[PDB]
Design a protein around this nucleic acid. Structure first.
Ligand SMILES: [Zn+2]
Length: 253
DNA sequence: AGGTAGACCTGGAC
DNA sequence: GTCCAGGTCTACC
């Protein structure tokens, strides 16, 4: 899921698990557990901790327990559900946290691409994968100044810049293409070639793009061959930053 | 060795 | 048997 849907999961999951105490952890695909590397230590350390909170950083969910934080990335098709220990697990269930009240937090993932890392709370932010993660796009910490500073410094295309997780959190292929379209900037342009006016406009559209989605219709992403919604020009697709890239050659410059 | 490009977690679909 | 999905932390220099 994208950032806005991860925020929805964060908001919806929290009341279903807050205040519950872990009694067991069952792991059916150890490779999902990335820290501690030994999934046995992962399972053992969580036992007896109570869920106190659930936060989001970029696309990462951060489950706050007593001593530890569990940092979870759903990647492609990871999903969490809360259900009774008495019911059969659903297909592709790879990790299960059993609570003392007979309920369970289940993690399902067809591709097995998701990741889990557990650290002491006070360490989580300075260890992978959260270490280096850029500012939240909806936060004052993500500013035109910050964006301009990174743009003027690189030889990369603007798209490559915006896909860099250290620049800003939670921007992937879709929102990058959409933001660039709304700002009227071609994705293949050198980041350093953007005028201050363009940086300001891109910042504004980046914020509106994720902002409208987190609170609540694509212009270019996956619409190649179809008419642009603003000028009717056919949307085109190329490779930029080694990625499938969608844009309107008339609206964007 | 800082900045960058892009390698890699797998099952499902071709 | 081959290829795709893809964000991001690795690894290349
Ligand atoms: Zn257009």
């Amino acid at each position: 899921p994208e950032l806005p849907e991860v925020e929805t999961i964060r908001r919806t999951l929290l009341p279903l698990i807050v205040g519950k105490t872990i009694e067991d952890v069952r792991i059916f695909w150890p490779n999902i557990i990335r820290h501690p590397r030994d999934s046995e230590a992962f399972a053992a350390r969580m036992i007896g901790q109570t869920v106190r909170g659930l936060e989001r950083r970029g696309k990462f969910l951060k489950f706050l327990l007593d001593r530890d934080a569990l940092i979870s990335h759903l990647r492609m098709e990871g999903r969490y559900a809360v259900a009774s220990a008495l019911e059969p697990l659903e297909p592709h269930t790879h990790v299960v946290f059993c609570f003392t009240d007979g309920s369970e937090l289940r993690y399902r993932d067809v591709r097995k691409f998701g990741t889990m890392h557990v650290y002491a709370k006070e360490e989580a932010d300075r260890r992978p994968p959260l270490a280096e993660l850029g500012p939240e796009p909806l936060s004052p910490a993500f500013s035109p100044a910050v964006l301009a500073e990174r743009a003027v410094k690189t030889k990369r295309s603007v798209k490559a810049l915006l896909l860099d997780c250290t620049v800003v959190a939670g921007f992937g292929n879709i929102y990058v293409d959409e933001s660039l379209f709304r700002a009227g900037i071609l994705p293949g342009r050198p980041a350093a070639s953007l005028s201050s006016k363009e940086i300001e406009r891109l910042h504004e559209e980046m914020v509106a793009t994720i902002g409208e989605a987190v609170m609540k219709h694509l212009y270019v992403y996956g619409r190649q061959g179809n008419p642009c919604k603003r000028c009717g020009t056919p949307i085109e697709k190329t490779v930029v930053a080694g990625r499938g890239t969608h844009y309107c050659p008339r609206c964007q410059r």
